[PDB]
């Protein structure tokens, strides 16, 4: 069965993300992602047992960040957490 959302939390804090943010051409501490954002990404932007549309969203969001710091460079960090997650992912989906 299924990631529970603790197992999908660790996978996307020790994988996923740094690999996005990699891949998205942002710096170590450029972009901040809280857990309660993850869970945000998993509880309303996918609908999965494992984690593919996870990390389709968590690259989603690492590419709006790396645009809004583009568009900006009076932004020298980006900080994502549960309330502004939709901010970057747009209206829930689930």
Same mark, same amino acid.
Request: proline fraction near 1%.
């Given at each position: +069965?299924?990631?529970?959302?603790?197992?999908?939390?660790?996978?996307?804090? $020790?994988?996923?993300?740094?690999?996005?943010?990699?891949?998205?051409?942002?710096? /170590?501490?450029?972009?901040?992602?809280?857990? +309660?954002?993850?869970?945000?990404?998993? $509880?309303?932007?996918?609908?999965?047992?494992?984690?593919?549309?996870?990390?389709?969203?968590? +690259? /989603?969001?690492? $590419?709006?960040?790396?645009?809004?710091?583009?568009?900006?460079? +009076?932004?020298?960090?980006?900080?994502?957490?549960?309330?502004?997650?939709?901010?970057?992912?747009?209206?829930? $989906?689930?």
């Amino acid at each position: +069965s299924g990631y529970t959302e603790d197992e999908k939390l660790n996978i996307a804090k $020790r994988h996923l993300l740094p690999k996005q943010i990699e891949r998205n051409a942002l710096k /170590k501490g450029e972009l901040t992602v809280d857990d +309660s954002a993850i869970i945000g990404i998993i $509880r309303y932007y996918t609908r999965e047992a494992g984690v593919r549309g996870l990390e389709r969203e968590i +690259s /989603k969001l690492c $590419r709006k960040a790396v645009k809004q710091l583009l568009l900006d460079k +009076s932004l020298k960090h980006i900080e994502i957490n549960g309330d502004n997650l939709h901010d970057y992912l747009g209206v829930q $989906r689930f």
